[PDB]
Structure 1
Amino acid sequence: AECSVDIQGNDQMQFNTNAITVDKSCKQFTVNLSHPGNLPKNVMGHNWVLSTAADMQGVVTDGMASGLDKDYLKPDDSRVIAHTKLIGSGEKDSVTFDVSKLKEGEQYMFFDTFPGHSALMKGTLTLK
């Protein structure tokens, strides 16, 4: 099975997809994030952040409260399973994580924690 996915976030506060599936037989999984557009990070920064569905609200609320110099994530937030950096237009960042962190029967969400973006920039992550 493939073990990576390419995700884009644009100047329109959109991701290219709202559903990612991770095949069990992957030991690691990589998300490659890019930002088409022209807007810089402080105004249209995007990141890809993974937690359980239950934790998504907290991560987003705490991240937004943390500010740009924290890339909009609360320091030491243990609800965050994996994430990319916050990137502005033209930049790119990849994260690779251990698939063993993810458990059967759990609901996962990926999302962006830049202020307001999770309204649109979120999706499900499913183990298969």
Structure 2
Amino acid sequence: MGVMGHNWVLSTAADMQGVVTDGMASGLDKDYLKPDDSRVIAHTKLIGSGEKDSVTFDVSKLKEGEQYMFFCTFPGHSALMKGTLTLKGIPGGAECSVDIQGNDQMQFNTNAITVDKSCKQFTVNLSHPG
């Protein structure tokens, strides 16, 4: 086989590689993440084709002048399945959620996520179509 999954994991840009590596070593049964990894600010579960999962996190855990990375920890996928997430304030002001897809070609459909700081909490809706 014949296994395919995506997840959505958030950490500081510095902690990204460490989270990816220990995630690989934790295996499929643990959603390819080390349980209770302190470096992981928020994460979805691992989902197969046709499934969906969401995660919500406090915007208080972020900071305006820091680099944050979102990525999939499924072994090898973090090469192309990564992107930046940054905190900003846009004149508006809201949308406090985003819809992300990972497909069969190791791709997220966005590579940059903006979180407004008027949001007290932020919501990621991950799907895995096909």
Give the structure-2-normalised TM-score: 0.65
2:94 aligned partner: none
Bigger helix share: 1
Give the structure-1-normalised TM-score: 0.66
Q: Which runs of no fewer than 5 residues in structure 1 stay unpaired? A: 1-39
Tell me the distance in 2 between the aligned counterparts of 1:76 and 1:98. Answer: 17
Tell me the distance in 1 between the aligned counterparts of 2:64 and 2:21. Answer: 26
Could you tell me the percent identity over the aligned residues?
Answer: 97
2:16 aligned partner: 56
Tell me the distance in 1 between the aligned counterparts of 2:79 and 2:7. Answer: 14
2:114 aligned partner: none
What is the root-mean-square deviation of aligned Cα atoms in Å? 1.4
**Deviation by residue 1:74-112 (Cα, 9 ceiling, x = unmatched):** 122000000000000000001111000001211000000
Tell me the distance in 1 between the aligned counterparts of 2:66 and 2:86. Answer: 9
1:75 aligned partner: 35
Tell me the distance in 1 between the aligned counterparts of 2:26 and 2:45. Answer: 14
Q: Equivalent of 2:26, from 66, 72, 91?
A: 66
Give the superposition deviation at 1:47. 0.2
**Deviation by residue 1:101-128 (Cα, 9 ceiling, x = unmatched):** 0012110000000000000000000111
Tell me the distance in 1 between the aligned counterparts of 2:84 and 2:36. Answer: 23
